[PDB]
């Protein structure tokens, strides 16, 4: 899967203006959503030679499992009796079917227009047995829990497979939940492509989005080192 | 409405331009009277020219203030369905079943 | 785009007023015929300035321009009355 994304960032004041702008452009109201992502890193207690059976170098990469969870577990006591829409973000036995993914380093190339990234994905339906927990499954594969983050935001559905993710991200720990996007919202614009003509056409769609949004919000290209999940 | 009242204010500015034209025909005509050899039409002349530049100045203040409203209205109250048909068919259907 | 209306409109106002004073100061002083046509051209330029103000204000105006139970029962009696079962 080749995902082509362009990111951005806004403040806590222009949220209604960006929601109104993208609502007038896309012609559809935003859809509230959230997702929890847990990252499993290789076990430091175990030591394995980074080499395949064919005498080839192997680079260690983290494994990210993501799923969904209804808002009934997210809304507390002071959030009740409120409209279930986009205006909520301004007030901030077996195992579940997880989504196993591994993201690679984006492609090179100076003066690039988009940010193409190769990500492998398999769907974990369920499990059983003695150690049926997903944590014990990752420990059986050879990975331990490193960190996790829960993101809540809104998404749009335009044309040509474009997604605009205006979301906030929090770090779920025991000592407290720290907001990484404290002060604004994180913007995203990605397309999932399963050919050179379709890749260049996707880049044309992203360039048309950046040209259409030019003047308001700027959508630059993130650094490769900021999307590399390899363990060093 | 907002654009209705402000549109009426713009029409008032246009009527102030018309008044500027009245005072223009008055300064030129009564000025020609002053240049025929008469001095008794002097007070109404000076009053008509003073009202000329006064109405013009009010047009500048209200017009520039209006443009300031145009600058201060971008983003707020200015842009930079089958539901009504379904409800229409429901009310019409209820009108058929209940004459 | 409003600053172009500031500079342009203000320039039309200064040309209108100052050109009007130049007009009245030239009406009061083949030289005579050249005064006739200079005064007439100043007047027509004032008319074009007023019309310009009207066009610009028109551009400003153009800038100002630019439940389920009742359905289940309703369709229920509608179908029962329609088919006459």
């Amino acid at each position: 899967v080749q995902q082509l994304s362009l990111f951005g960032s806004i403040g806590d004041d222009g949220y209604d203006l960006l929601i109104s702008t993208l609502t007038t452009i896309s012609g559809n109201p935003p859809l509230l959503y959230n997702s929890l992502c847990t990252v499993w890193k290789p076990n430091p207690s175990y030591d394995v030679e980074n080499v395949n059976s064919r005498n080839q170098l192997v680079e260690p990469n983290r494994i990210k499992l993501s799923k969904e969870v209804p808002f009934s577990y997210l809304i507390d006591e002071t959030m009740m009796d409120k409209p279930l829409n986009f205006r909520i973000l301004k007030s901030f036995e077996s195992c579940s079917p997880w989504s196993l993914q591994i993201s690679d380093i984006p492609a090179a190339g100076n003066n690039r227009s988009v940010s193409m990234q190769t990500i492998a994905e398999t769907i974990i339906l369920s499990s059983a047995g003695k150690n049926s927990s997903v944590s014990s499954l990752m420990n059986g594969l050879g990975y331990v829990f490193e960190f996790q983050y829960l993101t809540i935001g809104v998404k749009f559905f335009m044309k040509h497979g474009l997604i605009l993710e205006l979301q906030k991200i929090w770090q779920i720990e025991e000592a407290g939940n720290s907001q990484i996007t404290s002060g604004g919202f994180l913007l995203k614009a990605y397309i999932n492509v399963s050919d050179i003509d379709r890749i260049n056409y996707t880049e044309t769609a992203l360039m048309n989005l950046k040209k259409e949004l030019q003047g308001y919000i700027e959508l630059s290209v993130p650094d490769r080192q900021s999307m590399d999940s390899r363990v060093a | 409405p907002y654009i209705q009242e402000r549109l009426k204010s713009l029409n008032d500015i246009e009527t102030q331009l018309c008044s500027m034209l009245q005072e223009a025909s008055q300064v030129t005509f009564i000025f020609g009277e002053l240049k025929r050899g008469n001095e008794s039409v002097k007070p109404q002349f000076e009053n008509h020219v003073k009202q000329f530049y006064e109405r013009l100045d009010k047009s500048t203040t209200q017009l520039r203030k209006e443009i300031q409203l145009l600058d201060e209205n971008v983003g707020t109250r200015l842009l930079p369905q089958d539901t009504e048909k379904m409800e229409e068919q429901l009310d019409l259907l209820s009108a058929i079943l209940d004459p | 785009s409003n600053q172009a209306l500031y500079e342009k409109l203000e320039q039309t106002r200064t040309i209108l007023s100052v050109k009007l004073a130049e007009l009245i100061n030239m009406t009061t002083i083949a030289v005579a015929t050249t005064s006739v046509m200079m005064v007439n051209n100043q007047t027509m330029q004032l008319i074009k300035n007023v019309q310009d103000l009207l066009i610009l204000t028109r551009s400003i105006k153009e800038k100002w321009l630019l439940d389920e139970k009742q359905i289940e029962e309703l369709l229920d009696n509608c179908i029962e009355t329609f088919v006459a079962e």
């Binding site: 990111f7 951005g8 960032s9 806004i10 403040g11 806590d12 992502c37 990252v39 983290r62 993201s103 490193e146 960190f147 983050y149 993101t151 991200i169 770090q171 720290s178 990484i180 996007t181 404290s182 002060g183 604004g184 994180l186 630059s220 993130p222 650094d223 080192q225 900021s226 999307m227 590399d228 999940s229 | 003073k50 530049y53 006064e54 100045d57 | 203000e10 106002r13 200064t14």
Partner: peptide, 20 residues
């Protein structure tokens, strides 16, 4: 009479590595 928020690369770096 008249007069004439934050850093996108750092946030994404957190979403991919988890460093603050």
């Amino acid at each position: 009479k008249h007069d004439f928020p934050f850093n996108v690369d750092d946030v994404l770096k957190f979403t991919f590595t988890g460093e603050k």
